[PDB]
Amino acid sequence: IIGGTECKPHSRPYMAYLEIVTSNGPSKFCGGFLIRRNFVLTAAHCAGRSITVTLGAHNITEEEDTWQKLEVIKQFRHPKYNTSTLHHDIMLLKLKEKASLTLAVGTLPFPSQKNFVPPGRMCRVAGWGRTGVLKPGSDTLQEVKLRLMDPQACSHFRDFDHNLQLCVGNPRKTKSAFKGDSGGPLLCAGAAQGIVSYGRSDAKPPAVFTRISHYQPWINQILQAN
Numbered sequence: 081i082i083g084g085t086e087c088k089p090h091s092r093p094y095m096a097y098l099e100i101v102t103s104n105g106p107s108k109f110c111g112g113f114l115i116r117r118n119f120v121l122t123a124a125h126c127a128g129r130s131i132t133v134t135l136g137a138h139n140i141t142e143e144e145d146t147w148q149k150l151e152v153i154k155q156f157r158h159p160k161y162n163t164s165t166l167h168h169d170i171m172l173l174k175l176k177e178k179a180s181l182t183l184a185v186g187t188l189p190f191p192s193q194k195n196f197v198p199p200g201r202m203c204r205v206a207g208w209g210r211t212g213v214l215k216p217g218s219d220t221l222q223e224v225k226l227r228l229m230d231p232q233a234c235s236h237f238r239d240f241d242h243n244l245q246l247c248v249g250n251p252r253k254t255k256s257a258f259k260g261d262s263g264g265p266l267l268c269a270g271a272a273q274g275i276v277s278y279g280r281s282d283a284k285p286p287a288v289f290t291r292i293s294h295y296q297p298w299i300n301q302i303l304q305a306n
């Protein structure tokens with residue numbers, strides 16, 4: 081997160097810290113959010129050979145009792161996910177066991193309300209991502225308030241699609257989700273409307289978020305068949 085502020089410890093109990101393992105490379109890290117005690121929603125590009133989910137964390141460098149390091153039994157990457165266009169950058173992670181509900185760990189009510197369009201211009205996103213282009217991932221959970229933009233603002237991302245994605249972050253500001261924040265939820269009025277997907281390597285906002293409403297039927301199918 082760039083230009084954000086440290087979250088009040090555990091104030092976002094649904095946040096998930098993912099450590100992704102690959103065959104020929106060091107582990108990578110992403111965000112995500114718990115929507116069912118045994119299901120975490122994140123970005124499809126965060127897929128790997130295996131993934132470990134850490135719930136109840138704030139400062140991920142210091143283990144604590146609130147932590148729940150959970151095994152992922154199966155990764156459900158969206159069938160239409162495309163690495164060249166980055167469309168359908170969404171994935172569901174089924175946890176081997178159902179997480180414990182504590183003050184620090186809880187599910188994000190989803191679905192919620194009923195809208196094909198995310199109301200409100202100001203939303204908020206959190207993550208443990210880099211806080212700058214040459215800055216490393218944050219040890220603590222950071223959050224920032226961002227402006228939902230008209231699709232025109234993301235025209236420069238040639239594969240951006242208003243039906244499938246949200247344009248987030250006033251270009252006049254530095255505030256933005258960044259590398260390491262992928263998979264994190266975009267909350268508007270308390271409801272998850274998007275998922276951090278991608279943007280410019282130079283961090284100039286806005287960034288592209290997966291539009292959740294478009295995937296409601298796919299999400300319900302997966303949750304129903306598992």
Ligand SMILES: Cc1cccc2scc(Cn3c(=O)n(CCCC(=O)O)c4ccccc43)c12
Nearest residue numbers: 125257258259260261262277278279280281287
């Ligand atoms: C989430 C976000 C917000 C704003 C800007 C930017 S620029 C990249 C991202 C997220 N992001 C990422 O860091 N990788 C790994 C490449 C590492 C590498 O090539 O070094 C990605 C691969 C595919 C899609 C998005 C990716 C992002």
Ligand SMILES: *[C@@H]1O[C@H](CO)[C@@H](O)[C@H](O)[C@H]1NC(C)=O
Nearest residue numbers: 086139140141142143219220
């Ligand atoms: C996180 O905890 C580590 C100790 O393991 C500490 O060095 C670091 O400053 C903490 N992060 C912040 C900025 O609170």
Ligand SMILES: *[C@@H]1O[C@H](CO)[C@@H](O)[C@H](O)[C@H]1NC(C)=O
Nearest residue numbers: 160161162163164165166239
């Ligand atoms: C991804 O989409 C492009 C269209 O821009 C298409 O040419 C390519 O075959 C697709 N890749 C996959 C996932 O098959």
Ligand SMILES: [Zn+2]
Nearest residue numbers: 089138144146
């Ligand atoms: Zn704590």
